[PDB]
Amino acid sequence: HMTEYKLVVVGAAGVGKSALTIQLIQNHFVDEYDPEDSYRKQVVIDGETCLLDILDTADQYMRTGEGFLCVFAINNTKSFEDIHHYREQIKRVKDSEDVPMVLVGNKSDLPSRTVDTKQAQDLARSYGIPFIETSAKTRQGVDDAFYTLVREIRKHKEK
Ligand SMILES: Nc1nc2c(ncn2[C@@H]2O[C@H](COP(=O)(O)OP(=O)(O)OP(=O)(O)O)[C@@H](O)[C@H]2O)c(=O)[nH]1
């Protein structure tokens, strides 16, 4: 009686993968940095009752994931640069240029921005994927990121 979507959250250490997930699951912001596990969330997206199966990571998970949030932090230039490596990984495992993915630029609430929205838009355009800006602290963009990913999975494959 409901559709499962297997989502995987990837990106460099410290970017806010867990914080984003815990916002979606708990509606709370975890202040403290606790550096792999699985969460489930039932949600209605476009009148479909969805069971999200979310892997919060640090080939195994990549093989079976249906869509990926590729997360960097807007005050961490190295994390933005690292996106390439995560995307290449995902593409290799799937043997496809066409894998459901969203680029997420997290920590939008912080002042020390080193990656501008143009850099991020350029990257997402090159990849052919959406870009969503988030703050796990304020919850800005969090549902948007996850719901957009679900829509991208539907767009690619019958669910
Ligand atoms: N201000 C702010 N801090 C955040 C946000 N997202 C996460 N943080 C903080 O950044 C730190 C790292 O967040 P985590 O969610 O543990 O990062 P992670 O990507 O899961 O890191 P790993 O588990 O090491 O791969 C924590 O102190 C969070 O409180 C955000 O949107 N805004």
Ligand SMILES: [Mg+2]
């Ligand atoms: Mg984490």
